[PDB]
């Protein structure tokens, strides 16, 4: 069964939000309706502004700004590690966070900059377990 | 706990896809970055093309078409019931389907037109239980 009786009146579909997110990632893979390029040092990442805003306090601030909402190109701080950004962008579109000993510091610093609080909190807990 | 060890290597966040979908619905409520208006008889519905394509075989066909991907206005068949469309648009953004005796036929006919197969299948099962 794909549905249940929600707490409210409605029929609710268990996997709907993840099925939507999978299609948004498929659109991203195929570069369909992507409307922004995020530049991180020498690297470029195409994405959908709505997904970025939905996942980050920094992108939410940028794309709700009357002047910046219309930008096609966004340059991040040149100190941002592109691999850390790539891991977080994949997480936004998949719910899967590829945290490893060799990338955890860059992922945490990037999530702090992008304002993804629960990812920062998660990185902190994994770091504390090895200390 | 908000995360777990997925079947693959990654840490996976349980509520991430639904937290993304909630923010996409908040953006829609506030008319932020909406890029299309769907016209259903005398009624207009503002939405995000990526969400519509992610949820419907008809919108996926339209917005991947080289000519139609750029349209700001999409007119649906004038025989489509606006309430049925509204219930399905809310479902796309919430995972919640407000199926009632008084709207089930219009919801089913609209889901057939929009190519939302599992919603059609769900309507059919609820209809069959009252027959
Ligand atoms: C700071 N922060 C985060 O740590 C995480 C954000 N998003 C994700 C999806 C990663 C998220 N949200 C909630 C939760 C916890 C379980 C409840 C976890 N993960 C987030 C999203 C917006 N974005 C918006 C905020 C409010 N209203 C709107 Cl319309 C938007 C948008 N778009 C802002 C700031 C944000
Ligand atoms: C016909 N049909 C549907 O019944 C339902 C669609 N989407 C939702 C989210 C409502 C959905 N998907 C899967 C499932 C079942 C559990 C597995 C349930 N509900 C759907 C989405 C696309 N959209 C795409 C299809 C393929 N690849 C891409 Cl990139 C897109 C997009 N965008 C097409 C046709 C579709």
UniProtKB/Swiss-Prot annotation, chains A, B:
<protein>
    <recommendedName>
        <fullName>B-cell lymphoma 6 protein</fullName>
    </recommendedName>
</protein>
<comment type="function">
    <text>Transcriptional repressor mainly required for germinal center (GC) formation and antibody affinity maturation which has different mechanisms of action specific to the lineage and biological functions. Forms complexes with different corepressors and histone deacetylases to repress the transcriptional expression of different subsets of target genes. Represses its target genes by binding directly to the DNA sequence 5'-TTCCTAGAA-3' (BCL6-binding site) or indirectly by repressing the transcriptional activity of transcription factors.</text>
</comment>
<comment type="subunit">
    <text>Homodimer. Interacts (via BTB domain) with the corepressors BCOR, NCOR1 and SMRT/NCOR2; the interactions are direct. Forms preferably ternary complexes with BCOR and SMRT/NCOR2 on target gene promoters but, on enhancer elements, interacts with SMRT/NCOR2 and HDAC3 to repress proximal gene expression. Interacts with histone deacetylases HDAC2, HDAC5 and HDAC9 (via the catalytic domain). Interacts with ZBTB7 and BCL6B. Interacts with SCF(FBXO11) complex; the interaction is independent of phosphorylation and promotes ubiquitination.</text>
</comment>
<feature type="domain" description="BTB">
    <location>
        <begin position="34"/>
        <end position="101"/>
    </location>
</feature>
